[PDB]
């Protein structure tokens, strides 16, 4: 068996001590594969209307864009839940861009 | 007393005892009691996401792919110094690559 490697835009399920969480992958395949790590933002089903939330529209959740985190995806057993729509990735990025710059 | 509030570019100390470069704006850090940070280390191992922090005596390295949201107000945070504007830009520029933020 060959392992699933996170890619840009992937929605993933990741595990921590002690709980499992969805996250959106911001870094590209090359990086994620080489380092066994990735940049991502955490998701929840609870939308409270914070300025940095981005709606993730599924059948019938919110990504917290200010909550960027480097995670070792390989070691945490990341699995693929789905993929965000290009407009949703563009948006998460657009907000991260705010907290920071370019 | 008025607590120290991290501003973009500041070099802080946070316990868990680690230095970090604060990438997010002051309005944000102050409102949310959190900030986006990159961790700093003593020895540069040669990785491409390293950014040297040039001290008047000795130097240090900011690990730019290791962005993390940290609760400063909660973990406690103190100011060591401020990074050079070009040090701040390069760190962001490298993040901009790992992401593609527009």
């Amino acid at each position: 068996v060959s392992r699933y490697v996170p890619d840009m835009g992937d929605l993933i399920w990741v595990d921590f001590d002690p709980g499992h969480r969805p996250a959106v992958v911001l870094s590209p395949f090359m990086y994620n594969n080489k380092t066994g790590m990735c940049l991502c933002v955490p998701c929840t089903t609870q939308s409270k209307g914070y300025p940095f939330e981005v709606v993730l529209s599924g059948q019938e959740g919110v990504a917290l864009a200010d909550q960027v985190k480097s995670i070792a995806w390989r070691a945490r057993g990341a699995t693929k839940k789905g993929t965000v729509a290009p407009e949703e990735l563009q948006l998460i990025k657009a907000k991260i861009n705010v907290l920071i710059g370019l | 007393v008025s607590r120290y509030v991290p501003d973009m570019g500041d070099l802080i100390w946070v316990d868990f005892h680690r230095p970090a470069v604060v990438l997010s704006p002051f309005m944000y850090n102050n409102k949310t009691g959190m900030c986006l940070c990159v961790p700093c280390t003593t020895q540069s191992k040669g990785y491409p996401f390293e950014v040297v922090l040039s001290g008047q005596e000795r130097d240090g390295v900011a690990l730019a792919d290791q962005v993390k949201s940290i609760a400063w107000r909660a973990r406690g945070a103190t100011k060591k110094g401020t990074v050079a504007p070009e040090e701040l830009q390069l760190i962001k520029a490298k993040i901009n690559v790992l992401i593609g933020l527009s």
Binding site: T35, K69, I71 | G33
Partner: peptide, 15 residues
């Protein structure tokens, strides 16, 4: 904001 936690640092995560 509510700070999300991943628990104990894993692998190459330095923190």
């Amino acid at each position: 904001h509510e700070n999300i936690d991943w628990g104990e640092p894993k692998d190459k995560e330095v923190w």
